Design a binder for this molecule. Structure first.
Ligand SMILES: [Mg+2]
Ligand SMILES: [Mg+2]
Ligand SMILES: [Mg+2]
Ligand SMILES: [Mg+2]
Ligand SMILES: [Mg+2]
Ligand SMILES: [Mg+2]
Ligand SMILES: [Mg+2]
Ligand SMILES: [Mg+2]
Ligand SMILES: [Mg+2]
Ligand SMILES: [Mg+2]
Ligand SMILES: [Mg+2]
Ligand SMILES: [Mg+2]
Ligand SMILES: [Mg+2]
Ligand SMILES: [Mg+2]
Ligand SMILES: [Mg+2]
Ligand SMILES: [Mg+2]
Ligand SMILES: [Mg+2]
Ligand SMILES: [Mg+2]
Ligand SMILES: [Mg+2]
Ligand SMILES: [Mg+2]
Ligand SMILES: [Mg+2]
Ligand SMILES: [Mg+2]
Ligand SMILES: [Zn+2]
Lengths: 175, 135, 136, 38, 94, 130, 92, 58
RNA sequence: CGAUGUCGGCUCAUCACAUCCUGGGGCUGAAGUAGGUCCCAAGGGUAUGGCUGUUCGCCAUUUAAAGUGGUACGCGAGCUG
RNA sequence: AGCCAGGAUGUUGGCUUAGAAGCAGCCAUCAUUUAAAGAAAGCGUAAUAGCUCACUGGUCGAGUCGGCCUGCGCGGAAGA
C-alpha cells in the first residue's frame, strides 16, 4: 500500500527494460532479472517507476507494494549490491574458500564441503570469518542460511556459525 | 568514560570489603585512588563518606572531581539518629524543623544544580516526609 | 460447598428448565457473568468458582450467588439398568438460566472482572458473557 | 513442540502468525516460546 | 437533547414484532397521565447509542413522530433476557 | 498533547512573544542532556525559573504561533530552529551564550541567525550596552 | 485394568473393572473388584491404598519407640557432666 | 532454624531418681527459656509417688 | 436360539496408527556419554529365559523395545486343548 | 510505528540479610530540574555497575486506534 505509494528511483544510464511484467535491470555492476507477479500494473514515464494494481484483482495494492520493494531491491543491487560476512564464534572455528568452495572444520569426521553460485565469491583476509560480497541480497542471504543451517549453534555459550551484527542471548546451563 | 562513583567513609582507607575490585575494574591502581581521596579529605572532617566522580583515561593519569558529603547523612546528622525508620507510615520517629531544613539546604545548594533554594528545600522536606521524618 | 441444610424431599424429578429465564437482571453486585445457553452448575463448580474469585480479588470486595443446588439429582451409579425403580441420590446442581448472573464481583476493576469471569469459563463448560448492574 | 487447544499470545514481544492454518508463537527472547495448536 | 426519527406502528403483535426484528425495528410506546396512547417503532442502534449516555433516563428528549416534536421522559424499561436488546423503553410526557 | 492543551500553550507563547522582543536560537541535533543542563543552569542563574529551552519548531506550530508579533519567523519556524526567550534587560548577554555553546562541541545546528532583533545581519553583534 | 478372576460367567470374563492401585515407591498393591462400576472400583482401590499405607505409616512410630525404649536401660551411672548438690540445687 | 527432640529419663532408678528428673526438667526449661528457645511438652508420664516423673520428651 | 464355536499358545500373519522404540521436526528445568520430554514416521524390531491351570505382572541377562488393539477381544472347513 | 536523543537531582531512601546501592522480599512509593524520569516494567551481577523500557524531544507524513452485530473461513479432529 504505502510502499507502492512511494516513488522508485533508478540511476542515469542504467539499461532497465520492461517487457510486460518481465523487468530486467543491467548496468556497470551486473544484471538482475525476474518476471513479476501478475497482480501488478507497471509503467515508466521518463523518470520514475510506478506500481499499482490491475483491474479486478483482490490483492492489488498489496502485491503492487511487493513488486515495488522487489524492484527497489534490485535497483540497489545493480547500483552497488548487498554484502554479508558469515562469522564464526568458537574455540578454533575456521574455514576457507577456493573461488566458491568452502571447507568447514567444526568437529566432523569429514570436513564439510560447501558451494556458492557464480553470483557470490569469497576472499579470506581472516580464517575465522569469511568476507564474501555480491549484488544479490537474497542469494547471499541464502548462502548465509545454508552455512548457518549446516551446524546451527547451541544456546548456551555462543559457539557456532552466527551473524556479524548478532549478539548471543546467554542461557547459562544452571548448575 | 566509566563515570561510576563508589566510595565509603574516609575514616577507613582501602575500601576492599564494600566495593573493592569494583573500584579496580580497570587497570588503574587501588592505592592511588585512596591517596587522592585522602588528599582531598585532609582539609575536611574525617569519618564521613565523600563522593568523587572519575573519568579514567589510558595514560594512567586520572582526572577526578569531588563533591559535598551526601545529603542522606546530612539529614541523618540533622535528625541526630543513625537509623532512618521502620515502617514509617505506621509510627512517628522524630520532629524535623523547617529552619534547620533550610540551613541544611543552603549548605548543599552549591553542590546541587538548584538556583532557587526553596524548590530543593521542599525537595528535602518531602524526602524527610517520605522517610518518616515528619516536618 | 453450597448445599441445603434440609430439602423438601430426598429426591425430586429430573425437571425441566426450558424457554426463557427470569434471572435476567443483576441484583447484588457490580460485575457478573451471563450464561445464554443451558447446562448445569455443580455444587463443586459453584464453590470452586467462588474460591477462585476470592483468589483473584485477594479478599477485596464481595461475592454473590443466585442459583442454588437445592435439587439433589439422582443419577444412576454406573452399570445399573433403567429399571429397579428410580436411581440413587448422587449429587447436587443447579441448571443454566438464559440471562442469569451466576457469580458477582465488586471493588475491583472491570479488567479483573472479565479476567475472573473468563476463568469461570475455564472452570465451567458453560458459555459466558460479561455483565454489570443496569441503570434502572 | 506444544499440542493444546487454547493457544494465546505469550508476552509483550512475541508474534501471533498463521502458518498453514495453525497459530504459531515465537519469541527469541525465550527459546521456549515456540507454541502450536492441534 | 436527542431528536429521533420514529414512525407510527399501524398493526402490532408478536408476529409483527418478529418481522420487525428481522427488519431491524423495535417498538416503544408514548403515554402519560390522561393523553391518548400512541406507540412508535424506533431506530435500533441509534437508540442504543443514545441511551448509552448517562442522561437518557434523566433529561427531556424530543421525539419526531409524524412531523411533530413530543416532550417525554423515561419511566420504565424491559430488556432482552440474554442479549443487548432493550425489549421496551418507556415515555412519560413533559 | 491534545487540542485544548495546545490552545493554552499557544496563548501562553503568544503572550510571551508579545511581552518579550529579543530572541536567540539553539537546536538539539547533537545537544546532549549535558548541554541542556548547562544551558538550563545558566538560565537559572541569569534569570528566573520560567527560562525555557522548549522546542516548538514544527512545520505548523511555530509559524502558526508567531503571527501575533514578530511575523518574520515564518522563515524561522521549520527545519528545527528552537526558540529561547530573553525577557530581562535590553540586549542581554544570553545571545552570545548560545553561540559559545555551539562553539564548544556542538554540531552547529543553531546557525546563530538571531532573528535580526536590532535589524542587524546574521553575524554576531559584538557591541552590547554595559 | 484387567479381568476379574472368578470361575466364571461370560460377562465377568469381559469386565476390566478390576482396578489395581500400585504405589510405585513402596510397591504395595491393593485390588478392588467389589462393584461392577469401575469408577467405584477405582475409588475403593484408592481408599484401600490410603488405609494400607496408613498401616505402614503406623508401624514406623512403634518401630522407633522400640528404639526410644532402649535409652531407659542405656543410662550409664558415672562421669557426670553436671552436678547439683543439696536442696539449694547449685549448678556445677 | 534447627529442630531437636530430646528425652530426659530416670533410667532404671528409684523414686529419688524420679524426683531428680523432675527438678532437672524444671531447671532445663528455665535455662532454655533464658537462652531464648521455644519448646512444647510431648510426654510426661508420671512416676509412682508425688512430684516424681519417670520420663519426659521435649 | 429349524446353531454365527469361547480365553491363552503355534504358523501365517493381518491390518490400525493411535509411535513403545529406533530412523526423523522442537521445548527443555536439552552443555558432551547421557537421559525428562511435546511429536512425524507402521518399511521394521517388537528378544531370550524363571514363575504362572492364563494376554495379564515381577524377576535375570540383552537392550530400541519387549506397543494399545480390532482379526467375532485372531486365526479351530489351518493346529492344540 | 522506524529513524537521531533524554530518560536525572534528594537517593547509595530505609531494612533483614552474607553485600540489597532499582531489581531476594517489605514500607512510605513522594519532593526538585518538570519537554523527562516510574524508589522502578525487562535484561544482569555478588552488592553494584551497566544496558533498556514507560514517558517525552527530532523527521517521512493523512491517515491512525478500540468495542460491537452479522457472511464465510482457521485449529482443536490419530483404525485396525
Ligand atoms: Mg426455568
Ligand atoms: Mg497431536
Ligand atoms: Mg411462533
Ligand atoms: Mg459353574
Ligand atoms: Mg460380558
Ligand atoms: Mg441363536
Ligand atoms: Mg439355517
Ligand atoms: Mg451353519
Ligand atoms: Mg530428545
Ligand atoms: Mg504422527
Ligand atoms: Mg506397525
Ligand atoms: Mg508395516
Ligand atoms: Mg502404511
Ligand atoms: Mg518365558
Ligand atoms: Mg526347570
Ligand atoms: Mg491384535
Ligand atoms: Mg479383540
Ligand atoms: Mg477371539
Ligand atoms: Mg468357517
Ligand atoms: Mg480352544
Ligand atoms: Mg481340560
Ligand atoms: Mg474452528
Ligand atoms: Zn516472547
Amino acid at each position: 500500500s504505502r510502499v507502492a505509494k512511494a516513488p522508485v528511483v533508478v540511476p542515469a544510464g542504467v539499461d532497465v527494460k520492461i517487457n510486460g511484467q518481465v523487468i530486467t535491470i543491467k548496468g556497470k555492476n551486473g544484471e538482475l532479472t525476474r518476471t513479476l507477479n501478475d497482480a501488478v500494473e507497471v509503467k515508466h514515464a521518463d523518470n520514475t517507476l510506478t506500481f499499482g494494481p490491475r483491474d479486478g484483482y483482490a490483492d492489488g495494492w498489496a502485491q503492487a507494494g511487493t513488486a515495488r520493494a522487489l524492484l527497489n531491491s534490485m535497483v540497489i543491487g545493480v547500483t552497488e549490491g548487498f554484502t554479508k560476512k558469515l562469522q564464526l564464534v568458537g574455540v578454533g572455528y575456521r574455514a576457507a574458500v577456493k573461488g566458491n568452495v568452502i571447507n568447514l572444520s567444526l568437529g566432523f569426521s569429514h570436513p564439510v564441503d560447501h558451494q556458492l553460485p557464480a553470483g557470490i565469491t569469497a576472499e579470506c583476509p581472516t580464517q575465522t570469518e569469511i568476507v564474501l560480497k555480491g549484488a544479490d541480497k537474497q542469494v547471499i542471504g541464502q548462502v548465509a542460511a545454508d552455512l548457518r543451517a549446516y551446524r546451527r549453534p547451541e544456546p548456551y555459550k555462543g559457539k557456532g556459525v552466527r551473524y556479524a551484527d548478532e549478539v548471543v542471548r546467554t542461557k547459562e546451563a544452571k548448575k | 568514560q566509566a563515570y561510576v562513583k563508589l566510595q565509603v567513609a574516609a575514616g577507613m582507607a582501602n575500601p576492599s570489603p564494600p566495593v573493592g575490585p569494583a573500584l579496580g575494574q580497570q587497570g588503574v591502581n587501588i592505592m592511588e585512588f585512596c591517596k587522592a581521596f585522602n588528599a582531598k579529605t585532609d582539609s575536611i572532617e574525617k569519618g564521613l563518606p565523600i563522593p568523587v566522580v572519575i573519568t579514567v583515561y589510558a595514560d594512567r593519569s586520572f582526572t577526578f572531581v569531588t563533591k559535598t558529603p551526601p545529603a542522606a547523612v546530612l539529614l541523618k546528622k540533622a535528625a541526630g539518629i543513625k537509623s532512618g525508620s521502620g515502617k514509617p507510615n505506621k509510627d512517628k520517629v522524630g520532629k524535623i524543623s523547617r529552619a534547620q531544613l533550610q540551613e541544611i539546604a543552603q549548605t548543599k545548594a552549591a553542590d546541587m544544580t538548584g538556583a532557587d533554594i526553596e524548590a530543593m528545600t521542599r525537595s528535602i522536606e518531602g524526602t524527610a516526609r517520605s522517610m518518616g521524618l515528619v516536618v | 460447598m453450597l448445599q441445603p441444610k434440609r430439602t423438601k424431599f430426598r429426591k425430586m424429578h429430573k425437571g425441566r428448565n426450558r424457554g426463557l429465564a427470569q434471572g435476567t437482571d443483576v441484583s447484588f453486585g457490580s460485575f457478573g457473568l451471563k450464561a445464554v445457553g443451558r447446562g448445569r452448575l455443580t455444587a463443586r463448580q459453584i464453590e470452586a468458582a467462588r474460591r477462585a474469585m476470592t483468589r483473584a480479588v485477594k479478599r477485596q470486595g464481595k461475592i454473590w450467588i443466585r442459583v442454588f443446588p437445592d435439587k439433589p439429582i439422582t443419577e444412576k451409579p454406573l452399570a445399573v439398568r433403567m429399571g429397579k425403580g428410580k436411581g440413587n441420590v448422587e449429587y447436587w446442581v443447579a441448571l443454566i438460566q438464559p440471562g442469569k448472573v451466576l457469580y458477582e464481583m465488586d471493588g475491583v476493576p472491570e479488567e479483573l472482572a472479565r479476567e475472573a469471569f473468563k476463568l469461570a469459563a475455564a472452570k465451567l463448560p458453560i458459555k459466558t458473557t460479561f455483565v454489570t448492574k443496569t441503570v434502572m | 513442540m506444544k499440542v493444546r487447544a487454547s493457544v494465546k499470545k505469550l508476552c509483550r514481544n512475541c508474534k501471533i502468525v498463521k502458518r498453514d492454518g495453525v497459530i504459531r508463537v515465537i519469541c527469541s527472547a525465550e527459546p521456549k516460546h515456540k507454541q502450536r495448536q492441534g | 437533547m436527542f431528536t429521533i426519527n420514529a414512525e407510527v406502528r399501524k398493526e402490532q403483535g408478536k408476529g409483527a414484532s418478529r418481522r420487525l426484528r428481522a427488519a431491524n425495528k423495535f417498538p416503544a410506546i408514548i403515554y402519560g397521565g390522561k393523553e391518548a396512547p400512541l406507540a412508535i417503532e424506533l431506530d435500533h442502534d441509534k437508540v442504543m447509542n443514545m441511551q448509552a449516555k448517562a442522561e437518557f433516563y434523566s433529561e427531556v428528549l424530543t421525539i419526531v413522530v409524524d412531523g411533530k416534536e413530543i416532550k417525554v421522559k423515561a419511566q420504565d424499561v424491559q430488556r432482552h433476557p440474554y442479549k443487548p436488546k432493550l425489549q421496551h423503553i418507556d415515555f412519560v410526557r413533559a | 498533547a491534545l487540542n485544548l492543551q495546545d490552545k493554552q500553550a499557544i496563548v501562553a507563547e503568544v503572550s510571551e512573544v508579545a511581552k518579550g522582543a529579543l530572541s536567540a536560537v539553539v537546536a538539539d541535533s547533537r545537544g546532549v542532556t549535558v548541554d541542556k543542563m548547562t544551558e538550563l543552569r545558566k538560565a537559572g542563574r541569569e534569570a528566573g525559573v520560567y527560562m525555557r529551552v522548549v522546542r516548538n519548531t514544527l512545520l505548523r506550530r511555530a509559524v502558526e504561533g508567531t503571527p501575533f508579533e514578530c511575523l518574520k519567523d515564518a522563515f524561522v519556524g521549520p527545519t528545527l530552529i528552537a526558540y529561547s526567550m530573553e525577557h530581562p534587560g535590553a540586549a542581554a548577554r544570553l545571545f552570545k551564550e548560545f553561540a559559545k555553546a555551539n562553539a564548544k562541541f556542538e554540531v552547529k545546528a543553531a546557525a546563530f541567525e538571531g532573528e535580526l532583533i536590532p535589524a542587524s545581519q546574521i553575524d554576531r553583534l559584538a557591541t552590547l550596552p554595559t | 485394568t484387567t479381568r476379574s478372576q472368578g470361575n466364571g460367567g461370560q460377562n465377568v470374563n469381559k469386565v476390566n473393572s478390576a482396578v489395581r492401585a500400585t504405589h510405585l515407591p513402596t510397591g504395595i498393591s491393593v485390588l478392588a473388584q467389589d462393584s461392577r462400576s469401575q469408577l467405584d472400583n477405582k475409588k475403593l482401590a484408592l481408599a484401600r491404598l490410603k488405609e494400607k499405607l496408613a498401616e505402614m505409616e503406623l508401624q514406623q512410630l512403634a518401630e522407633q519407640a522400640q528404639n526410644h525404649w532402649n535409652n531407659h536401660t542405656q543410662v550409664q551411672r558415672g562421669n557426670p557432666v553436671r552436678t547439683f548438690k543439696g536442696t539449694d540445687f547449685k549448678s556445677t | 532454624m534447627e529442630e531437636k527432640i530430646i528425652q530426659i529419663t530416670a533410667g532404671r532408678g528409684p523414686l529419688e531418681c524420679q524426683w531428680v528428673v523432675a527438678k532437672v526438667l524444671k531447671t532445663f526449661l528455665q535455662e532454655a527459656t533464658q537462652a531464648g528457645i521455644s519448646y512444647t511438652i510431648l510426654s510426661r508420664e508420671e512416676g509412682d509417688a508425688n512430684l516424681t516423673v519417670k520420663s519426659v520428651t521435649l
